[PDB]
Structure formats: structure tokens, C-alpha cells
Design a protein around this ligand. Structure first.
Ligand SMILES: [Mg+2]
Ligand SMILES: [Mg+2]
Ligand SMILES: [Mg+2]
Ligand SMILES: [Mg+2]
Ligand SMILES: [Mg+2]
Ligand SMILES: [Mg+2]
Ligand SMILES: [Mg+2]
Ligand SMILES: [Mg+2]
Ligand SMILES: [Mg+2]
Ligand SMILES: [Mg+2]
Ligand SMILES: [Mg+2]
Ligand SMILES: [Mg+2]
Ligand SMILES: [Mg+2]
Ligand SMILES: [Mg+2]
Ligand SMILES: [Mg+2]
Ligand SMILES: [Mg+2]
Ligand SMILES: [Mg+2]
Ligand SMILES: [Mg+2]
Lengths: 164, 50, 156, 273, 205
RNA sequence: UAGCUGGAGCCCAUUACGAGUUCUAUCAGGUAAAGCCAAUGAUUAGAGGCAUUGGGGACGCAACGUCCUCGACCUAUUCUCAAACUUUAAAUAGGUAGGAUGGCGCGGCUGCUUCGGUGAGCCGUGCCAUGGAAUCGGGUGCUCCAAGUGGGCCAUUUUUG
RNA sequence: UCAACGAGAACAGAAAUCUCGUGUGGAACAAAAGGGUAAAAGCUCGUUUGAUUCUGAUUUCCAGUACGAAUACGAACCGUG
RNA sequence: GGAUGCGAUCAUACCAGCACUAAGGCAUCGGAUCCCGUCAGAACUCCGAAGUUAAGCGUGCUUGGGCGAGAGUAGUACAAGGAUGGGUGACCUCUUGGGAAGUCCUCGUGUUGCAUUCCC
RNA sequence: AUCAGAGUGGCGCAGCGGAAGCGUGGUGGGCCCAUAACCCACAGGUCCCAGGAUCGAAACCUGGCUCUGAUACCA
């Protein structure tokens, strides 16, 4: 049924950059991610100390940020222009959402303001409808009913029928 | 030479020779060990009875 | 000490019942106890403060003291050829009110009423219970009678 | 989707926990009276907020369930004059003040403990007059976060100025300075009289001709300008102090109609090819 | 090698299985329990014969292996290797200990071997076959009886195959279409479940 | 050293107070049995499905395809088990109660408790209370002084090596 | 809110980081084992020193002694909220 | 016949899939100056009423899983007492008493306290 | 019979959780008419096996397998 509360909308866009180091390599990944987001990023310390990748326990190796609002829509479509506005169709999660990756500089924003390299990055975006609050509020949490959920099929259509 | 020995043999017989005594039931039971706040007040109430 | 700890042999005694773990219902905290009532002790595994020693579980004593958060219970314990009246304090979570004299009070107030009631009439009756005795004679209506007989042995 | 063994070993939580409305760690610690008081109830000053109303109640614990000593709502403020803004900080003070006055009149001591008539931003505690100490209740905040400026602490001030004794500290009142460790009575008083809404009414109607229209439509509908907060709330306060007082669901099918329909489904399926 | 079995005949101890406590156990002599054909269906082999224990005792793993082979070799030769299904109904889950100057100081034994705890009226071996080959069933178990210590009987099952239905009841429920096959087992259908899960000839009330 | 024993008594007593016992009522238990087609663990065999690729052969001029093969894995079953497993759960044995050491009215005390005669308790007075299941019967009831003993052994039942 | 599992994202795979869903605890709680705990007793963050003073009582041990350990009040001074 | 706030019992109340709801209430929902809060006004906090019953909620359905109860299992397993009882024994029996558990079958799926409120 | 010890490069041996080497031996060049000796490089490891804890193991506890020393008396 075509009730207006059912309009699909992005709740957040998350940008992930995993490096596997510390010091300056990951610090400059922070700046590209900050300057892309407009907000102070957060670091992600490692776990399990897998020596084949040379990472210890509790040492920061990645950097991600979760943007939402108009910055998200502006930033999302720039990522999709890079991908030429198409996706692998296996990119869509079973539940409700999808992601892709790029090589940094092909976005808008000068390269060597800090003389910082081409950090590829993970754009992962999660869709929703109205009322997803009911599974995220503190008082009276509950499952979002099946009809208000977004399936992979609805995300497929949302991508193609509009937004482009 | 095996010097450790334990048993409860004959012990219930010894116990029941002079009965399994129960203590005598008493009017005005003992208040030792009750709440001291409660006991001061009970003492003060009795001090000022008419 | 001396070969066994406080909670020795309490694997099954102190465990909570099946599907009855977690939250303690509010009824336990709302019950009010008075010096002289009867209380049955049964430990709760969750509450590790105020616990009675495992001998007092499943025993019925009288209330003799009341503080905040705790009741003084009064259990007899046989030690040799005597009975020692042990005095312990247990937290409220470990006791429940007993119904060991439920009947007595209902029978006591029933006794007083009939005693005064028949005194309004000719004033002699006996309010004593009586053990079940022998049935009087009675006639049974002739009806269907089913014979039963020993069954031959079946090898399987 | 869950296995048979999963359901057999499953334990359900207390109903008010599954539905997600009661915090039982706090409930036990709020209701649980000391055993050497024997029936002295612990009264809870329950304050709750819906999106559209404000519920306030004085309740105490019983085995059958709680028992209301007095209840009040903010949707009944229009009786006393306030028509709009029934879920904001100032309304909570009015709803709190209303609850204090009803119970103090209902317990026949409102003459003795008037509270204070002019609402002040200062933290207030009523004096132990003589021979009859003031009524005592515990603030029961529920699941909300206790934050500085939270409306539940607006409701707390009203009850204190109504004449109730409630255990409290002033660190969560609006205006408190987390970095200076002191109360600001002026900021507290402005919030009490809704002046924090008034500032945002002025700020929109100047630099936002349309945001001021939509965002305060009911205020505008009723002729309540931002310079009519202190005057309008004081009247509602003084008014409260001066007079505190078929089938639509399907029925379950009987045994016959379930067995009736089941015979059809059986006949239908068996005959289905 | 082994002690004479008479040391361990009578059931005298609480069960002593291998566990995180009992370790360093040897491996049991018997390691195959269903021999012959365990691929045939329920409706093929309806007649069943059992060898049943008749006194409470232990049965060693070696004795139980020896009985399996004695029954297997016989039943193969007369009626062919595809005429029968032999199933051993007892498993050796009990450990035995042995206490090997030093006397009864610290006498708890180390594990010796494995055995099965059997009771009166308990099935030791079961065989299902066609009614025609029942004679080689009767003798094969009797020839196996002399591998067991105690007293044993040869009782012909009142049931069908290795299934929990009387031959009378299985045939009735088969012809009425109420029993779905499984393999060695049969599965009677009832009045429960979601209706759609049933095939349209299999829904019943 | 405590227990068991003697002697000395003394204090009450058929009012009552009890009891190696039952009946009535009410608590508590995890052993026997049972279970595994309930969690943990052990263990036999098939049957049906199926992969996001555990592996390959053949067909793949290709793949976001398969037929087999040992098989994972999934579903419904199936044999057999547990001192240091268990949802369930005895028989016997365990605890408490069955009035005169009960109840009520009145008016007092409190420095405890309450928003508060609100309670909690106690004090004084005045009334009631057919003796509140069966059976049996004087009491270590109270106290003192002290001896010997502190190698045990046997039988039915449960039970460890 | 854990263990784990499912579905997804450049390098990235069995396994680095991120995201959504399921999740009665299948994780964690210094150490043996057992019991106990899910808006916690686990994890993260804040503020702290009740790991304080005084002497009595009781429980386990038990001779109803001592020690060890624990529990419930009383009289204080504080922490936290 | 409904609802909210606080609850009692803590599955006949849970779980899975579905379907539907008059009024009022809840909720979703709009915003970010202010208090407050985060990587992120998503959460939390605050101010708000432009829309929507789509979700939450509530109620119902299923030869549903579970849970609860009944009948059976079965006077069976076991077990208190007795026997100059049987048997080589393991074990069993009789006498005087107590007496379970799964499968399998049938039924059921909440009850309700206080305060304020809606029907029509 | 129990118990101490020891299993690491082809061989003899060191290795104190971040974690693999010493001598000799192997392989390819050089020097020589040609071999050694000498010179320059290069490559080596189921750390006895199966666990378990551990930031993290060849090392630390547990089990399994193989070599060695020991103490086993009064009669
Ligand atoms: Mg001796
Ligand atoms: Mg002892
Ligand atoms: Mg000692
Ligand atoms: Mg000693
Ligand atoms: Mg128990
Ligand atoms: Mg402690
Ligand atoms: Mg709280
Ligand atoms: Mg002596
Ligand atoms: Mg036990
Ligand atoms: Mg058993
Ligand atoms: Mg059972
Ligand atoms: Mg099992
Ligand atoms: Mg009894
Ligand atoms: Mg002596
Ligand atoms: Mg907490
Ligand atoms: Mg002591
Ligand atoms: Mg060379
Ligand atoms: Mg050379």
C-alpha cells in the first residue's frame, strides 16, 4: 500500500578507511575522512593480534565516520558518480542496505592540501522508513513491523526508479 | 595398628537414655540480642509508666 | 572449617528452580513480619547476604527479632541429647510466611463462636476434632456387577 | 525460526520488562520499606511525560498493585488558564504544583504548609513546622535520563513550592552550572515561567517569518505573545493554588467453529489433487 | 591377557563411564553394531527374532564381539548375506578396573576393559528377516547364545521388523495409508501439524 | 574433654507437662525410578534435503550451472547410556502447629516509627475462653560430686576399595 | 549488551575495520569446582576510598571453647547518586 | 467494548508467521535558539503540532513450537515392614502398607488492582 | 615397578613467552692443470604428538610416544 509514512530515506552514511598502522599513515587518513565529512572522525582499535597483517591488540588501525543529513546525500551521490551510478546487485544486504568503495581523489576536494595520499574508502549506506525509532528508543523498544522494513528488493527499486 | 576409626554406632542409643531434652518453655522470653534502638525505647516507656 | 566449608554440599540445595531465576518478585519484600509469627526458611541462591547456613533451609521457626532488611528466626537444632534453640538473622529474601497454623486460627475463631453460640442455648458442647472412625451400616442398590478373574499368563 | 529446545528452556522476564516500561532495580529500591516499620508505605512521587501530556501521581506499594493517593495531568491545565505548551518545563512546574496542592488538601495539611506562593528559582525546602512534619515522597523518574534542565526537575520544584518534602539536591535544576557548582536562580526562574520559550519566539519572528508561524501556531492562534509569559503563567499558578481539586474486536472462535473450519480445510486439501 | 570373566560377572559398582574423570581407557572390542544389510526397508523384513538376557550381569566387550561374529558367519552361510539384518542392542559403556611387596595400599585400579550392564528381560541381539528364513534366524542366535555368560532366551517379536508396531497394527495402518516409511523405521501419521505440510492423500483426522 | 553410669538430694506433680508413636494441617528435599524422541556429555544406523564453491572426475568453446564421489551441513527419525548429567520425580526419613504462656474492650507510657493514633511494643484495669486430635505416662524438673570407658566385634538392609 | 551466527562494503581472503538482523547467555566475572548474575554481578565512562572508628551479638567449626571466615543491628564519620 | 500512568501474578502472559481496528489515548512525527548530548539532534535532551495509522500498541487466526491442565502410562518402576519364603546363585515371590516419569492422546492460551479517560 | 631427565637444521648442541641459531655438513661461483685446504655468497627447520590457559609459545600445566639414570631393605 502507498501510505506516505512509508517513504524510504537514508538514516546514515558511514565511511570506513582501514589501514593497519598508526602514527602518521592513519593520522592522515583521519584528515581526508574529516575533510570529507565535516566532523571529527573516530579511530577503531584492533583485536586478535593477527601477525600476518602485523597488528597488535588494542592498537588503532582504522578510521570511520557516520554522516547523516544533507551532507550525506551530497556526499553519497558524489561517490555514486564515481561508480557511474551502478552497483553489482550483490552489493545489497539481505536486510536493508548497501555499500561500495572508491579510490579517494576522484571526489571533489583538492589532493595535497596536507600532501595526503590516495586513501581508498568504504561507503556503506543504510536505508530506513519512518518509525525505525521504535527499535532504537530507550523506553518501549520493539521490532519494527515487517511492513515498515526495507527489503533488498525495495532498496533495488529505490536505487533505480529514482535518486538518479 | 590402623588407628583411625569413626562410627555413629550406639550414639542414638546414648542420646535417648536421658531423652532428647527440650528447653523449658518460658513466659517472658529473653530480649538479649534484639534491636538496641527498640530495647532502649521499651526501657524508657516502662520508666515513665504511671 | 575442619573439612567442609560454609556452602559445602549445597550444589542442589542452593540452586534456583528451573525457569525461575533472575528477577525476585515484589511480594517477598511487601510481606511484613512480627515478633511471634512463624516463618519457613528457604534460601535464595541470588542473595548472597543474610544467607542462613544450609541446616536451616527447609525448617520452620518463630520470629523473635526484626531489624531493617532482616528477620530474626528461631530454629531448634538437635545436638547430642538436647535441643538447642538457635537464633539467626536472615534477610527477607530467604524466608516465607508459613501456613503451619493457618488451620488453627480458622478453627480457633470457629471454636469461640460455637462455644458462645451454644451457650445462648443449653451451654454444653465439645469443639474437639475427631480422627476418622468406622462407617455405619447402609444399603446398596442392586445394580450392574462386573466379575473380574485372574488373567492367563501371556509370554509377551 | 527458533528451535524447540530454545522455547523449552526459555524464561520470560517480568511483563513490565518485556513491554519495556519499568526498571525493577529502581522499583525494588524505591518501594522496599524497612521491616521494622511494618506498614509505613513509601510514597513515590511519580512524574511521567508523554509526547502530548504530563502525568503526575502520588502512589504507594501494595501486594495487589499500587494505589494512587492523588493524580494530576497537564491536559487539565486549560481549566486554570494555560492552553498551549502543556509538555514544556513551565507546565511541569504547574503540574507538579497542582499535585502538591491536591494531596496536601486531601491530607488536610495544606493550611499548615502553603509552600511559597511566588515561584522562586531558588532551591526550596519547607520547614518542619511543629507536631506535624510535611508530607514526604520520593521522586520516581522512570526510564528517562536524569539530565540538568530535564523537565522532571521542573516538576520537582513545583511540588517543593507546593509544600511537599521530597529528598533532592539542586544539581539538576535548569540553570545549574556544571563548571561552577552553583545554582543560577535567575535562569531557573526564567525556565519556570517559560521564558526560555519566549526567547525562541522572539528569535524566530525576527529572523524567520515562517518558522515563527509554523513552530508556534497554537501560541499565535490564541493571542499569546512572547511578552505574555510571566503574566500568563502567574495567573495559572495562583489559580491552581486557590482551587486544588460497542463491539469492534473479533471474538475468539468457539470450539465448534474452529472444528467447523478445520474440517473444511481438511476436506479442501485432501480433495486438492 | 584378560582375567577369567568370572572376576567381572556380577554388577557390583555404580556405572563408571569414560569421562573427563575416567581417561586412559582402552578401546572396546566391538566397534560395529549393525551388520548384514542395514539398507532394506520396513516392509521387506517383517519377522523379527530377539536374544534376550534373563539375569542381571555384565557382558564384556570381547564376548559381545564374539557373539556378533558367530551370529554373522552362520546367518550368512545358509540364507545368503542379504537375507538378514543383525543389530546389537547393547553397548559397552562401563569401564572395569584392575589393581596390579605392595598390597592393599592405594588400591584404586587402573582401567582394564569395557563391558555392558545388562538386566533381566533386556534384548542383547535382534535380527529381522523374511518369515521364510526364520530358521536360520533361530539357530544363528542360539549358536550365539554360547558366547554369553548368563541365561538367555530366544523370543520372536510380536512386532514388525525393527519397528514399534504389531504386525497386526502395521498392516492395518499401512493399508489405510496412515504410515509413511522412513527406512529401517516407520512413521505413523496423526492429527497434528500445519495442514499445508501434508500431501493431499496424507491429511487425516 | 563431652557422652553413657552411680551416689546425694532438692523442687514440684495426676491440676497440668510431656512423648524414639500415630492422626489433621502445612513447609523442605533431588536418592531410587525415569529421561535423552528436553540442556551438558557419550554413542549406533540409516532416510529425506541441501550448498554462496569442504574436494574433485564428466559435461562446462562460458557462467550469478550441474550427475556422481567420500561427505560436511539442514530436517524428521532410530539403538544404546551417565557417582562427579538432568526438565520430572517417589517410598522411607526431616521441620513446624493442633489454646489457660488464647482473645477482647477501656485508658496510659515511649527518648522508637509515622504526613498523621500512624504504628510497634509495653503497662494498668476489666471482662470472656466446654480445656480445643488419638494413645500413654509423674517428671533430669533442677543441681552437685564422682567412677569406669575412649582396641570392639557380629547379623539383615543401603554402601566404598 | 555478551558468545556465536546470517547478510553486506577498495585493497580484504578462514581471519584486520565498518553496517544491519538474530541472539536465555550458549560469553564475562584474578585463580579449582560448584552455584549465582542481562536497563547486571558482564563491558565503557564519571566521581571516589565503607579495604574507616568503637565495643558488643549471632552463624559455620563446636566441647556449643579459641582462631579463621561470614552475617544482622547499635553509635559515628564519609563516598556515591 | 477500548486507553494511558503506576502495578500484582510473572509464558494459559512466550515465540513464529499473518490479518484488522470507531472514538479518545498512545505513538509515529517537525525542529535544534535554549539546557543537555554524541563521530553522528540516530540515541539522549529540549521546543513543537504541519501529516499518519505505515510501524509500535491493541485484538483475532494457525489440524503452528512452547507453556499449562486432564486422562493414560500403571497399581507398572521403585520403595517401608515381615517370612526356618523359592532358588546353587544372580535374583524373584507372597504378606502388611506407600506408589512415580517420557513417548502417546484430549482440552486451554490468561487473570487482574488503583487513578484518570474514550465510547455511543 | 615407580620416579627424575631428554626429544629443536643432515649430525652433535644451545635457545627466560617480541617468535630459530652455533659448530660441522649441503648448494652455486672463485683460486688450481686438477682435488682438498682457503675465499665469496645461497638454502635449510612435521621445535616428539594431542590439548588447554596465555597480549602473544619451541618454552607454561595437562595428557599420549620413544631413548637415559636411578631406588627398591629386615626376614
Ligand atoms: Mg579407637
Ligand atoms: Mg565433621
Ligand atoms: Mg583446627
Ligand atoms: Mg585436626
Ligand atoms: Mg534443590
Ligand atoms: Mg561480600
Ligand atoms: Mg536508575
Ligand atoms: Mg568424662
Ligand atoms: Mg547429591
Ligand atoms: Mg539412577
Ligand atoms: Mg524422567
Ligand atoms: Mg542427552
Ligand atoms: Mg510432616
Ligand atoms: Mg577419659
Ligand atoms: Mg548498572
Ligand atoms: Mg567463631
Ligand atoms: Mg665449492
Ligand atoms: Mg675445488
Amino acid at each position: 500500500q502507498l501510505n506516505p509514512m512509508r517513504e524510504i530515506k537514508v538514516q546514515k552514511l558511514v565511511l570506513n578507511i582501514s589501514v593497519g598502522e598508526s602514527g602518521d599513515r592513519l593520522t592522515r587518513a583521519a584528515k581526508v575522512l574529516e575533510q570529507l565529512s565535516g566532523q571529527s572522525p573516530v579511530f577503531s582499535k584492533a583485536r586478535y593480534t593477527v601477525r600476518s597483517f602485523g597488528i597488535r591488540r588494542n592498537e588503532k588501525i582504522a578510521c570511520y565516520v557516520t554522516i547523516r543529513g544533507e551532507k550525506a546525500m551530497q556526499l553519497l551521490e558524489s561517490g555514486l558518480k564515481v561508480k557511474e551510478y551502478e552497483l553489482l546487485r550483490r552489493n545489497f544486504s539481505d536486510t536493508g542496505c548497501f555499500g561500495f568503495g572508491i579510490q579517494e581523489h576522484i571526489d571533489l576536494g583538492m589532493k595535497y592540501d596536507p600532501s595526503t595520499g590516495i586513501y581508498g574508502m568504504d561507503f556503506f549506506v543504510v536505508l530506513e522508513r519512518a518509525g525505525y525509532r521504535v527499535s532504537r528508543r530507550r523506553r518501549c523498544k520493539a521490532r519494527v513491523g515487517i511492513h515498515q522494513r526495507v527489503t533488498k528488493e525495495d532498496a533495488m527499486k529505490w536505487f533505480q526508479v529514482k535518486y538518479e | 595398628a590402623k588407628s583411625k576409626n569413626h562410627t555413629a554406632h550406639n550414639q542414638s542409643y546414648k542420646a535417648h537414655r536421658n531423652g532428647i531434652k527440650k528447653p523449658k518453655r518460658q513466659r517472658q522470653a529473653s530480649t538479649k540480642g534484639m534491636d538496641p534502638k527498640f530495647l532502649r525505647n521499651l526501657r524508657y516507656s516502662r520508666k515513665h509508666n504511671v | 572449617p575442619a573439612g567442609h566449608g560454609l556452602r559445602s554440599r549445597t550444589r542442589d540445595l542452593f540452586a534456583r528452580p528451573f525457569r525461575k531465576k533472575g528477577y525476585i518478585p515484589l511480594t517477598t519484600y511487601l510481606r511484613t513480619y512480627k515478633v511471634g509469627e512463624h516463618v519457613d526458611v528457604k534460601v535464595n541462591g541470588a542473595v548472597h547476604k543474610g544467607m542462613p547456613h544450609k541446616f536451616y533451609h527447609g525448617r520452620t521457626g518463630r520470629v523473635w527479632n526484626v531489624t531493617k532488611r532482616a528477620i530474626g528466626v528461631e530454629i531448634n537444632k538437635q545436638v547430642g541429647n538436647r535441643i538447642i534453640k538457635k537464633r539467626i538473622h536472615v534477610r527477607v529474601e530467604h524466608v516465607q510466611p508459613s501456613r503451619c497454623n493457618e488451620e488453627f486460627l480458622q478453627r480457633k475463631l470457629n471454636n469461640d463462636k460455637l462455644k458462645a453460640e451454644a451457650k445462648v442455648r443449653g451451654e454444653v458442647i465439645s469443639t474437639k476434632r475427631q480422627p476418622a472412625g468406622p462407617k455405619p451400616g447402609f444399603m446398596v442398590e442392586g445394580t450392574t456387577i462386573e466379575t473380574v478373574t485372574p488373567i492367563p499368563y501371556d509370554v509377551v | 525460526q527458533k528451535t524447540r529446545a530454545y522455547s523449552k528452556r526459555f524464561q520470560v522476564k517480568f511483563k513490565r520488562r518485556r513491554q519495556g516500561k519499568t526498571d525493577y532495580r529502581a522499583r525494588l529500591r524505591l518501594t522496599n520499606q524497612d521491616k521494622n516499620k511494618y506498614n509505613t508505605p513509601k510514597y513515590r512521587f511519580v512524574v511521567r511525560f508523554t509526547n502530548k501530556d504530563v502525568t503526575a501521581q502520588i502512589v504507594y506499594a501494595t501486594i495487589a498493585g499500587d494505589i494512587v493517593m492523588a493524580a494530576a495531568y497537564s491536559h487539565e491545565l486549560p481549566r486554570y488558564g494555560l492552553e498551549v505548551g502543556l509538555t514544556n518545563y513551565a507546565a511541569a512546574y504547574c503540574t507538579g504544583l497542582l499535585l502538591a496542592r491536591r494531596v496536601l488538601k486531601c491530607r488536610d495539611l495544606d493550611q499548615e504548609y502553603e509552600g511559597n506562593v511566588e515561584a522562586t528559582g531558588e532551591d526550596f525546602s519547607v520547614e518542619p513546622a511543629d507536631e506535624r512534619r510535611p508530607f514526604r515522597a520520593l521522586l520516581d523518574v522512570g526510564l528517562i535520563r536524569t539530565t540538568t534542565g530535564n523537565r522532571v526537575f521542573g516538576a520537582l520544584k513545583g511540588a517543593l513550592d507546593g509544600g511537599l518534602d521530597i529528598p533532592h539536591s539542586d544539581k539538576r535544576f535548569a540553570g545549574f552550572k556544571k563548571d561552577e557548582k552553583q545554582l543560577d536562580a535567575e535562569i531557573h526562574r526564567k525556565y519556570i515561567y517559560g521564558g526560555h520559550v519566549a526567547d525562541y519566539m522572539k528569535s524566530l519572528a525576527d529572523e524567520e517569518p515562517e518558522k515563527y508561524q509554523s513552530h508556534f501556531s497554537e501560541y499565535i492562534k490564541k493571542g499569546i505573545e512572547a511578552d505574555n509569559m510571566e503574566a500568563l503563567y502567574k495567573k495559572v499558578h495562583a489559580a491552581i493554588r486557590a482551587d486544588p481539586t460497542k463491539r469492534y474486536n473479533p471474538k475468539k472462535l468457539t470450539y465448534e467453529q474452529r472444528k467447523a473450519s478445520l474440517v473444511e480445510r481438511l476436506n479442501a486439501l485432501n480433495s486438492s489433487a | 591377557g584378560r582375567r577369567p570373566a568370572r572376576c567381572y560377572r556380577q554388577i557390583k559398582n555404580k556405572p563408571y563411564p569414560k569421562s573427563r574423570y575416567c581417561r586412559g581407557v582402552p578401546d572396546p572390542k566391538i566397534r560395529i553394531y549393525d551388520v548384514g544389510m542395514k539398507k532394506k526397508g520396513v516392509d521387506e523384513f517383517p519377522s523379527c527374532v530377539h536374544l534376550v538376557s534373563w539375569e542381571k550381569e555384565n557382558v564384556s566387550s570381547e564376548a559381545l564381539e564374539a557373539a556378533r561374529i558367530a551370529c554373522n558367519k552362520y546367518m550368512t552361510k545358509n540364507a545368503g548375506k542379504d537375507a538378514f539384518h543383525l543389530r546389537v542392542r547393547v553397548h559397552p559403556y562401563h569401564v572395569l578396573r584392575i589393581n596390579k611387596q605392595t598390597g592393599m595400599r592405594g588400591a584404586f585400579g587402573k582401567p582394564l576393559g569395557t563391558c555392558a550392564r545388562v538386566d533381566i528381560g533386556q534384548v542383547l541381539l535382534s535380527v529381522r528377516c523374511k518369515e521364510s528364513n526364520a530358521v536360520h534366524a533361530d539357530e544363528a542366535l542360539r549358536r550365539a547364545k554360547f558366547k554369553f555368560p548368563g541365561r538367555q532366551k530366544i523370543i520372536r517379536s510380536r512386532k514388525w521388523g525393527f519397528t514399534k508396531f504389531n504386525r497386526a497394527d502395521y498392516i492395518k495402518y499401512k493399508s489405510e495409508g496412515r504410515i509413511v516409511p522412513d527406512g529401517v523405521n516407520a512413521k505413523l501419521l496423526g492429527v497434528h501439524g500445519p495442514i499445508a505440510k501434508r500431501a493431499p492423500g496424507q491429511a487425516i483426522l
